[PDB]
Structure 1
């Protein structure tokens, strides 16, 4: 049921720590706790270890990704550039 109608996951800190702080942690407590869809084992057991490490349950293949999310805006863009500077006519 819609128990807490605005805060969602940040019903654990409760009364305190300021309004706009909890608004700005809610977006990023969700992101590190979700079960991301693994690109290798096909399953959704992507779970992070300690910060910057991501880990899938089946096939047990450990990938360094973002610090809170799995990817980064930097991560896709540098992957975009590095293939593009690779296929630039022999390196």
Structure 2
């Protein structure tokens, strides 16, 4: 039952706040509310509690991550470079 043509979660705002602002906030409104796969348990229970706080519903192993996503593309390459520097020339 397709109810909306293009607008998704940001359909709650209605006709206000403009069009491009809703289009830009929808991209992260999709992510900040979608459940993620727990890297420790293995289930899709990673609802965020607050800004940057993501706790699981099974083992409750809380992790600090991005504000709107579980991990940021900047922190990914930061961790990669940290590992590379650790392995190079024995830390």
The bucket for the TM-score relative to the shorter chain is: over 0.9
- The alpha-carbon deviation at position 4 of structure 1 amounts to 0.6
Q: Which runs of 5+ in 2 are unaligned?
A: none
Q: Distance in 1 between the 2:62 and 2:6 partners?
A: 35
- The alpha-carbon deviation at position 49 of structure 1 amounts to 0.6
1:36-71 superposed Cα distances (whole Å, 9 cap, x missing partner): 011100111001011010110001100001000111
Runs of 4+ in 1 over 2 A off after TM superposition: none
- The alpha-carbon deviation at position 89 of structure 1 amounts to 2.0
Cα RMSD (Å): 0.6
Q: Distance in 2 between the 1:62 and 1:12 partners?
A: 30
Q: Which runs of 5+ in 1 are unaligned?
A: none
Query: In the alignment, which residue of structure 2 is the partner of 1:82?
Result: 82
- The alpha-carbon deviation at position 2 of structure 1 amounts to 1.1
Q: Distance in 2 between the 1:30 and 1:49 partners?
A: 16
The normalised TM-score by structure 2 is 0.97
The normalised TM-score by structure 1 is 0.97
Query: In the alignment, which residue of structure 2 is the partner of 1:59?
Result: 59
Q: Secondary structure, in 3 states, of the residue corresponding to 2:90? A: coil
Q: Secondary structure, in 3 states, of the residue corresponding to 1:40? A: coil
